[PDB]
Ligand binder design. Structure first.
Ligand SMILES: N[C@@H](CC(=O)O)C(=O)O
Ligand SMILES: N[C@@H](CC(=O)O)C(=O)O
Lengths: 911, 911
């Protein structure tokens, strides 16, 4: 029955049916209910068709018989456009279901009571240290006093920077539906029979509601609002829950005070409407809009919880607040008459409410009108104005003997205010160096002094330092401006006009020089920005990384810059970007080294350095693995301040479920604290040498395939949906489409290519290297974590899918090239297994393996569907006999979009 | 430790420590945490003082040594005014804590799986039938088809009429705190150690927050708002949860449809601001105000959940709604931009939102301004206008294939709308017959036609029928009006002007005649009320009850009245009122008979009769007992329409906790349905005869003590805090103060007096009567339920408290009178025990016994405190040596108020 579907699913994932392992059951239950829904909505035949795709696809994943893939192919090419959309919709939705189930399983999986203490424990959610356990290791194993631990945490800073979903920001409505499905599932395993019957019917109903929210592309403004949804869903509440647990952990190590409510321990930021790199749709107007939206939403969140705080704050008992209440003494849900003065905390909070309302309304009018007449004194323009009256309530309760009450909801609110400020996320701006060069070259030519672009690096620096202390402005009204130059100058206009608490960093993409950084500083001074954004270079190519040290050295040598920077500098690294240039192995090692070198240079100059981790690192995986990934960082690269990218495709895993949200915040904080007092071992010299030797080879293999093979590009454009995803060659292609196109094929070339040659050569040069590599794997956190990510990527790989795409889409003369990349994949995988000490992929993480494995049949169905869809899109003369319509003006591009989104939702993070 | 307090509490309530019996543990935990709070806030010495009062009081309740009561007395009279308030505050708060604990215990107590099927099962929450089990008994035992059962429920009507708390409407803020204490307690027995530590600290904090919400009397408007709080807390959500369970129960008996969303199964009403009987503070203005408030709140509740429904209703798929959406196509929390038309359900619900807002705002302006310019078309003036667009969404989802989605939140909302309408509660007006007589006598004299008051009953009727068809109005501008006559006429003005959906019944207090009812009908016609309120007589004294039949017969004989009444009449009975006149036994029996007789008369005339149950009956107990109480009603007295008083002092028990709320709604519905198809046995003729004989004697004893003893009044005024509760003789005293004054003394004279003589005489006249009475107890639901309520009242009794009040407050020459009432109490109790077949009070309901028993020590402490406080208030020359202040311009009246409220909160319902 349900028993039958359960049995089916267990053939792919068998063995240890323990008591907290319910994942297969959850999946069975959801799939069962969804198959009924499909029958009701679309008819028995369609249900049977979906069931048959699933079955065929399961059998192919079980035994890997390519006849099975071909059968599923036949079935799928025969479907008319309409049936084909329903099938793609069905399997995408099954994926979202399996992901909700898996989150529930990770949320309730049992922790290991006794931990071995090896660093490997920190790779796994069930064994990793929580905040208390981290405190205790630091006190007992590293001989820190509890006070020292407390003091470091007080000064610590963790900043999570949210980026756009590369394929599909899940809309607010749907995400809530996903939440309720998950909750109904949870509650079903808590239970009276009638409750079960009712929950059962409520589950059924929510699965359907989700499926039928299934309606061209979205505005960046809307993409921003969709990306902010997780605040409401979890983070908003989660921050105070986690800070409260810090309090408890501090108490359990002998610290008899709460973690101060205004320690800036957690900060969130955003690139959404800020990053315009290679993206001219992100205009100045978009930037202004998302700043106002962030401000609107934050005030609105405070406003919509302040009435609850006012109810709870009924107390009648200090003179400081008494006085304020007396001074102060309509269209709202709760306190719509004047508050009486015998309710003093409500008089204060009543004023805070009104002010919050006015702050929210100004932003709304600024947004939809263009201006508002609402004045500064009616509104909060700075976060201290909002804290102040809340601190007053806190103190008044303490002075009147009610400390204990103060530390309830009021303390929660104080923390939310301190963490989220007036703008939930501070926005980073990002733009590429060449755009700044263009802007300056327009200025220099118009001024008649030559062409900045033609100038040497020394000349650029000399001219920029002279104009950074210039007495005249640079830009006259008659400066002629291309659209691109205007768009870049008007971005600074927007920075000059919006409050500084809207913004974080100005990241320079494709940075290579001292002058790139100075260029942006000059444009900010020219716009007279009261509080210039800090300037952060992103060095992308290997060569750029190699030139970064000399570039920072020079910046830090310049009096004007040192004085401006005030002891602090941030530098950004992008793992996926560097891996596109050099292969992932060589980018990993180079990035390790570069960070060492820049840390040393910072120290020498008495500058505190923050490394901002862009996408594609081990640290962006989420979950347990992020925890060891953080502790693997080179010594002193964190030093009390973490700034990391939370990748769009991981946001749901990290923050969709309340427990996972809590644990994400916890491991980021725990890991940051620990690393500064307990660095991973530094590598043995033999390891460096071998890693250098392996980098040279890995880069040679990767580059010879990706850049020197004259037909690589052509192979890429056929074997991969890259071109269709649009809706020079590889050097010019951006990192996201690179990773994505190969992830859609289940092949992942960008992640593993180069590791094969590195290993083969090392082991062939000297047999003893195998053992050295294995020791590196057991003992060197950096190496372990590097290998693990790639191992996780191979578990999501299926060379049979790549083969099928070759048969359908690649011309015959390219097929053997494809075949040879598949042999490289196999050989690379096997070398990685031998180094990891494993027979099977992920035998060190069987819960992850199970999760990925349950997804495969669904993903595979979408892959097969996609492959034929691309055949049809690409070739209007390919046709087959379509079956008479099975279901009860929408095209092939629509089916492909569903396919791409479904695969990406099942593939989640890779490289 | 905590172990120590647990042991202490178990000495009063020992034995069967089973697994779902946690009440003592809960109490221990709360008391433990509260004792710490007291130490922190007021010092160790005060904590020790509270502990010692508790101990002394526990020992007195254990062994009943009167030396122990005297010690507690000494301690308590020695306390200065300030210490004395803290102690009274502490013990009142302990009571509220024990009540929250007890609710949690009743919420989670385990149901008996197998029920014996005796009607006694329905007295007890653990054994009573739920709605499904009621359905099944009707189908299988009474041979009803499931369709017949379904049809009766569809036509069934249950109306719960909320009345003011007689002592203290708990304010909205505090009630929420009580809720969170209870929740934190629940969650503590669900659990990771850190969660427990956090819940532990959250419990601690909420206990304190409650204790320090401890701030002259309240406006009826405010009393009304406080009495409405339970809607927000439970009832609002509870109605749809219960209707959904009806759906499930129907499905489980083979009915394949949901209970229709607009079946008026549940209705709530209110007397708050409506009842002005003996209460001139309840003015026309108050009535207008609470109608507008009810309207304001209801719109506000719909408004504040409509945004959630709009989020969830994302669906894009019927032409009827499509069309409406197109036609329709800012300052809010969620949808503050214009809704797009590809979101059709949101366009519709967006309009409903705006309309709800405007409906809420009109009422607010009408209330605080006096008028609004906001027009009828901007606002809902009738419930169908609000349903209509919701029915449209429901139909559109069904027509587009989404039946299952429609039956989620949308169906819930539809039910809330159908149940609560535009005014959460419909308001009853009540005023006494003599006020109408006065108003008419003013009219007749001014008209020069004589004095209505002087006229006979026949003349009154003749004149009223002639003027009910009169062609001129009665009231000219120059009619002279006392303040009372004006207040009564202006009430009808308010009825003429407010929408009819604000109101329910016009109850006439002290009704005796046909003409009393006609009088009110004439005043309503004179005010041209479009939809006159139905006129409902409340016959109070025995003699009035005896004259009621001839009065209804005459009304039902009059063409004008029959035509006006349109086949329907409601009559009200007041158990506490009739018991004040005749003693509770004789009022119970007479009320049984009168209801029989009026049912017969209704039938004869083809009038459907509703009996409205005023306060003081078995049916007002709440909990399990209410369930048998309902099924005990005389045959055909319910007949598909129940209308009962939910007494203010029981509201918290019935609706404060969500499970209890659900079960209250369930038993009212289950019991009503069943009774109409399965009447209790009718009494054997020997039983009637004996009951008549016992009534004559019970009334003679009660009346000879209460009305003929010349010094009774004087004894009452000293032994009881009656006079102080103010802030002819007994005939003139209202029922609430009568019950209350004796409940404050733990003596309860009004409930049991008369039962002693009834039993003694019956058993002495003929020994065989003992056995007849016992059979009546085992077999006759009416008798059983009658005896049970009195048995529950004796469990709350303590003649030692009455004795102490006598020593302190009654003069020596009255003390033996007091002593003789105590001998009557003892003898009456023992007779009741013998008839019930019990050795101890409540051995048939040990869970109730435990609950009442845990409260006693607290109540006793307050009693002792009260007794000396009254001594001090009454006698400014009584003094004792006060102890130096123990704690770290407030008087004796304040301590007494705390005392009275505390005792009433522990005594809950009695007579
Ligand atoms: N985020 C997981 C992978 C996944 O669940 O797709 C990991 O990196 O281990
Ligand atoms: N309401 C309960 C009495 C109580 O708990 O005070 C009953 O009537 O049985």
């Amino acid at each position: 029955k349900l028993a039958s579907i359960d049995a089916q699913l267990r053939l792919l994932v068998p063995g240890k049916v323990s008591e907290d392992d319910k994942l297969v059951e959850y999946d069975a239950l959801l799939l069962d209910k969804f198959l009924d829904i499909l029958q009701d909505l679309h008819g028995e035949d369609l249900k049977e068709a979906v069931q048959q795709c699933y079955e065929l696809s399961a059998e192919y994943e079980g035994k890997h018989d390519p006849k099975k893939l071909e059968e599923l192919g036949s079935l799928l090419t025969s479907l008319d456009t309409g049936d084909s959309i329903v099938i793609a919709k069905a399997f995408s939705h099954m994926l979202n279901l399996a992901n909700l189930a898996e989150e529930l399983q990770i949320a309730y999986r049992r922790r290991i009571k006794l931990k071995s203490g090896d660093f490997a424990d920190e790779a796994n959610a069930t064994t990793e240290s929580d905040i208390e356990e981290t405190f205790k290791r630091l006190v007992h194993k590293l001989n820190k006093s509890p006070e020292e631990v407390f003091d470091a945490l007080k000064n610590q800073t963790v900043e999570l920077v949210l980026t756009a979903h590369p394929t599909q920001s899940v809309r607010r409505s749907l995400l809530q539906k996903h939440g309720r499905i998950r909750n109904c599932l949870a509650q079903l395993y808590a239970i009276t029979p009638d409750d079960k019957q009712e929950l059962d019917e409520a589950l059924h109903r929510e699965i359907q509601a989700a499926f039928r929210t299934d309606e061209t592309p979205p505005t960046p403004q809307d993409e921003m609002r969709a990306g902010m949804s997780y605040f409401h869903e979890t983070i908003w509440k989660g921050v105070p829950k986690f800070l409260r647990r810090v309090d408890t952990a501090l108490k359990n190590i002998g610290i008899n005070e709460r973690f101060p409510y205004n320690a800036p321990l957690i900060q969130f930021s955003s690139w959404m409407g800020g990053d315009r790199d290679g993206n001219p749709r992100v205009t100045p107007e978009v930037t202004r809009d998302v700043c106002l939206l962030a401000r609107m939403m934050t005030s609105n969140m405070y406003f919509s919880q302040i009435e609850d705080l006012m109810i709870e704050m009924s107390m009648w008992r200090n003179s400081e607040l008494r006085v304020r209440a007396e001074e102060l003494y309509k269209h709202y849900i709760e306190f719509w008459k004047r508050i009486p003065p015998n309710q003093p905390y409500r008089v204060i909070l009543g004023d805070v409410r009104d002010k919050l309302y006015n702050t929210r309304e100004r932003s709304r009018h600024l947004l939809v009108d263009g201006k508002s007449d609402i004045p500064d004194e009616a509104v909060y323009t700075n976060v201290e104005q909002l804290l102040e009256p809340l601190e007053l309530c806190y103190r008044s309760l303490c002075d009147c003997g009610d400390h204990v009450i103060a530390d309830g909801s009021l303390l929660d609110f104080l923390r939310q205010v301190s963490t989220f400020g007036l703008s939930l996320v501070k926005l980073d701006i990002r733009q590429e160096s060449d755009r700044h060069t263009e802007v300056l070259d327009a200025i220099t030519q118009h001024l008649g002094i030559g062409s900045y672009r033609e100038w040497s690096e020394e000349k650029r620096q000399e001219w920029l330092l002279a104009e950074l202390s210039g007495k005249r402005p640079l830009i006259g009204p008659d400066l002629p401006k291309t659209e691109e130059v205007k768009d870049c100058l008007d971005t600074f206009k927007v920075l000059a006009e919006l409050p500084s608490d809207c913004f974080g960093a100005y990241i320079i993409s494709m940075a290579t020089s001292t002058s790139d950084v100075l260029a942006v500083e000059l444009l900010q001074r020219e716009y007279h920005i009261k509080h210039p954004l800090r300037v952060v270079p992103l060095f992308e190519k290997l060569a750029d990384l190699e030139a970064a040290p000399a570039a920072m050295t020079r910046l830090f040598s310049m009096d004007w810059y040192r004085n401006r920077i005030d002891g602090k500098q941030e530098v950004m690294i992008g793992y996926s970007d560097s891996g596109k240039d050099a292969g992932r192995f060589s980018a990993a090692w180079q990035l390790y080294k570069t960070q060492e070198q820049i840390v040393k240079i910072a120290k020498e100059f008495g500058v505190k350095l923050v490394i901002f981790h862009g996408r594609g690192g081990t640290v962006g995986r989420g979950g347990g693995p992020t925890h060891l990934a953080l502790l693997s960082q080179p010594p002193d690269t964190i030093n009390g301040s973490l700034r990391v990218t939370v990748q769009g495709e991981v946001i749901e895993q990290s923050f969709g479920e309340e427990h996972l949200c809590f644990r994400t915040l916890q491991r980021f904080c725990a890991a940051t604290l620990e690393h500064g007092m307990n660095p991973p071992i530094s590598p043995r010299p033999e390891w460096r040498e071998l890693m250098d030797q392996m980098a040279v080879v890995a880069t040679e293999e990767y580059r010879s395939v990706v850049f020197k093979e004259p037909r690589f590009v052509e192979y890429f454009r056929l074997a991969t949906p890259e071109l269709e995803f649009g809706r020079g060659g590889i050097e010019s292609l951006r990192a996201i489409p690179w990773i994505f196109s190969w992830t859609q094929t289940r092949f992942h070339l960008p992640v593993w290519l180069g590791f094969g040659a590195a290993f083969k050569h090392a082991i062939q040069k000297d047999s003893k290297n195998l053992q050295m590599l294995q020791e590196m794997y057991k003992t060197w956190p950096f190496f372990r974590v590097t290998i693990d990510l790639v191992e996780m990527v191979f578990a999501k790989g299926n060379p049979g899918i790549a083969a099928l795409n070759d048969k359908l889409l690649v011309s015959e003369d390219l097929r053997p090239f494809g075949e040879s990349l598949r042999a490289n994949y196999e050989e690379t995988k096997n070398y990685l297994l031998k180094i990891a000490g494993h027979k099977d992929l992920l035998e060190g993480d069987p819960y992850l393996k199970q999760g990925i494995r349950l997804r495969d049949p669904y993903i595979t169905t979408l892959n097969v569907c996609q492959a034929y869809t691309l055949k049809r899109i690409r070739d209007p003369n390919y046709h087959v006999t379509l079956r008479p319509h099975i279901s009860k003006a929408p095209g092939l591009e629509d089916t492909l979009i569903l396919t791409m989104k479904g695969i990406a939702a099942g593939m989640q993070n890779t490289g």
